[PDB]
Design a protein around this motif. Structure first.
Motif, PDB file in Angstrom:
ATOM      1  N   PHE A 185     -65.320  -3.814 -37.262  1.00  0.00           N
ATOM      2  CA  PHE A 185     -64.816  -2.854 -38.230  1.00  0.00           C
ATOM      3  C   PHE A 185     -63.475  -2.350 -37.710  1.00  0.00           C
ATOM      4  CE2 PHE A 185     -64.521   1.160 -40.549  1.00  0.00           C
ATOM      5  CZ  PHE A 185     -64.889   0.760 -41.825  1.00  0.00           C
ATOM      6  N   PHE A 186     -62.529  -2.162 -38.622  1.00  0.00           N
ATOM      7  CA  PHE A 186     -61.197  -1.643 -38.285  1.00  0.00           C
ATOM      8  C   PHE A 186     -61.065  -0.286 -38.946  1.00  0.00           C
ATOM      9  CE2 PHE A 186     -56.753  -2.461 -37.037  1.00  0.00           C
ATOM     10  CZ  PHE A 186     -56.088  -1.557 -37.805  1.00  0.00           C
TER      11      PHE A 186
ATOM     12  N   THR B 291     -59.744  -2.886 -49.778  1.00  0.00           N
ATOM     13  CA  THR B 291     -61.115  -3.189 -50.174  1.00  0.00           C
ATOM     14  C   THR B 291     -61.260  -3.410 -51.671  1.00  0.00           C
ATOM     15  OG1 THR B 291     -61.499  -0.791 -50.078  1.00  0.00           O
ATOM     16  CG2 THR B 291     -62.316  -2.131 -48.244  1.00  0.00           C
TER      17      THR B 291
ATOM     18  N   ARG C  41     -58.707  -8.993 -43.831  1.00  0.00           N
ATOM     19  CA  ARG C  41     -59.993  -9.476 -43.333  1.00  0.00           C
ATOM     20  C   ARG C  41     -60.331 -10.873 -43.848  1.00  0.00           C
ATOM     21  NH1 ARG C  41     -64.091  -5.779 -41.101  1.00  0.00           N
ATOM     22  NH2 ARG C  41     -65.422  -7.397 -42.042  1.00  0.00           N
TER      23      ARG C  41
ATOM     24  N   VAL D 233     -56.234  -0.935 -45.048  1.00  0.00           N
ATOM     25  CA  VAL D 233     -57.150  -2.046 -45.282  1.00  0.00           C
ATOM     26  C   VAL D 233     -57.452  -2.059 -46.768  1.00  0.00           C
ATOM     27  CG1 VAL D 233     -59.492  -2.913 -44.857  1.00  0.00           C
ATOM     28  CG2 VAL D 233     -58.129  -2.048 -42.944  1.00  0.00           C
TER      29      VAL D 233
ATOM     30  N   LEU E  15     -69.992  -2.511 -44.474  1.00  0.00           N
ATOM     31  CA  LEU E  15     -68.739  -2.310 -45.191  1.00  0.00           C
ATOM     32  C   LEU E  15     -68.977  -1.520 -46.468  1.00  0.00           C
ATOM     33  CD1 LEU E  15     -67.015  -5.714 -44.717  1.00  0.00           C
ATOM     34  CD2 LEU E  15     -67.231  -3.782 -43.134  1.00  0.00           C
ATOM     35  N   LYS E  16     -67.878  -1.146 -47.122  1.00  0.00           N
ATOM     36  CA  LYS E  16     -67.999  -0.498 -48.418  1.00  0.00           C
ATOM     37  C   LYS E  16     -68.739  -1.406 -49.394  1.00  0.00           C
ATOM     38  CE  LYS E  16     -65.125   2.138 -51.434  1.00  0.00           C
ATOM     39  NZ  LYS E  16     -63.697   2.557 -51.569  1.00  0.00           N
TER      40      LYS E  16
HETATM   41  O1  ORO Z   1     -64.705  -3.355 -46.125  1.00  0.00           O
HETATM   42  C1  ORO Z   1     -64.504  -2.191 -45.824  1.00  0.00           C
HETATM   43  O2  ORO Z   1     -64.903  -1.197 -46.419  1.00  0.00           O
HETATM   44  C2  ORO Z   1     -63.662  -1.963 -44.610  1.00  0.00           C
HETATM   45  C3  ORO Z   1     -63.613  -2.838 -43.556  1.00  0.00           C
HETATM   46  C4  ORO Z   1     -62.796  -2.529 -42.411  1.00  0.00           C
HETATM   47  O3  ORO Z   1     -62.660  -3.231 -41.416  1.00  0.00           O
HETATM   48  N1  ORO Z   1     -62.127  -1.328 -42.484  1.00  0.00           N
HETATM   49  C5  ORO Z   1     -62.152  -0.441 -43.528  1.00  0.00           C
HETATM   50  O4  ORO Z   1     -61.501   0.598 -43.517  1.00  0.00           O
HETATM   51  N2  ORO Z   1     -62.959  -0.790 -44.597  1.00  0.00           N
END
Ligand code: ORO
Ligand code: ORO
Lengths: 206, 206
Positions: free
Chosen positions: B34-35, B121, B149, B119, B25-26
């Motif tokens: 992962f989405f 973050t 998430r 999403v 993830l970032k």
């Molecule tokens: O945590 C992230 O960076 C992250 C998770 C995810 O599922 N999708 C996304 O675009 N970023």
């Protein structure tokens, strides 16, 4: 004109996108009418706008593989046009956006590309998109616009004709100035506006 | 979960938006899934995506007056969501876009605003939009996202909970991690992925 073209004109008039009066174009030329796509400013407006773009695109019969939306104004127009092709014509088109006024998003930029715009006033913005399109191995097949004003650009031919010549593509419009004139002839109540536009066509039309 | 939520999960899986494996993830955290909303990359994808956003929005019952799309990724998402509200729910919503990553386009920025995202973050991008919203006299009522998430952010609470606390708004998601887990329990053939996600929830979930 076709039914959807009359419907688009009525739509643009009802949403104040198409207005008559005393307008100064980007050229500095004075026009008895102006088409301001900025005023398609609600979700129903966007939905109908995409449906009219998609109908113009299908009616033209032009072959294309991908719908390109150049930043900034092209992205919402391409989005709703792509949605309308899927929802109303059962066509699932790849799209690509340039987050640049190249930072590309969407599907792989490949094949015959249809660029979306609203009103063409100059060819410069189209060349920037053409270079990104060509840099990724694709080809500019056409430019899809709302209104072709059918008047001289900087030289002898219209701005749309300059785009077709300079970038070797087809321009597809939902309506033209000719369609607007035909619409007004149907309406006794705006006979005065009809005379002002016909007068404008004779002085500046192509 | 509701039918449209199961349908969204199947849609995301079929378009390779939702994938399982070994992702970073970032955050730097490692996740078994992962989405990637970048892979909604065709016009039918955009059409269905807007319909799922709109259904989540109507199902939530939250009151809002305007749909705001912040550049760059918010503009296509807001566009298709606005179209879907009109086409599938007979709701004609003003929209506004910020052509800024303020240069505002669309309807007058007023009232209770629903910001669209994919999403979350971090809360930083949302604060920039909040300041433009407040600078024009409007109020941030909610943030509409694809997937919550449901894991810790930088502190003790989730990133979504930080947004709700810090900007005093509601977050509306189409699906949550809980929904993804419930979906996988229905499917014998991905029992192994179900175990990897449940394991991930226990270590990082909120
Ligand atoms: O945590 C992230 O960076 C992250 C998770 C995810 O599922 N999708 C996304 O675009 N970023
Ligand atoms: O010539 C222009 O600048 C122009 C004319 C018109 O009708 N609409 C527009 O956006 N620009």
């Amino acid at each position: 004109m076709k039914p959807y073209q009359r419907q688009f004109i009525e739509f643009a008039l009802s949403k104040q996108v198409l207005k008559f009066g005393e307008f100064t174009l980007k050229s500095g030329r004075k026009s008895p009418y102006f088409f301001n796509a900025g005023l398609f400013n609600t979700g129903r407006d966007l939905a109908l706008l995409g449906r009219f773009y998609a109908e113009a695109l299908v009616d033209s019969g032009i072959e294309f593989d991908l719908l390109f939306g150049p930043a900034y104004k092209g992205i919402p127009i391409a989005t709703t046009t792509a949605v309308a092709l899927a929802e109303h014509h059962d066509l699932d088109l790849p799209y690509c956006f340039n987050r640049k006024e190249g930072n590309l998003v969407g599907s792989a930029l490949q094949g015959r590309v249809m660029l979306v715009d609203d009103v063409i006033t100059a060819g410069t913005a189209i060349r920037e998109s053409m270079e990104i399109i060509q840099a990724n191995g694709a080809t500019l097949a056409g430019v899809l616009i709302s209104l072709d004003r059918q008047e001289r650009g900087r030289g002898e031919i219209s701005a749309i004709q300059e785009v077709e010549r300079d970038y070797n593509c087809k321009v597809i419009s939902i309506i033209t100035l000719k369609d607007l004139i035909a619409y007004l002839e149907e309406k006794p109540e705006m006979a005065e506006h009809l005379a002002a536009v016909k007068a404008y066509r004779e002085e500046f039309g192509v």
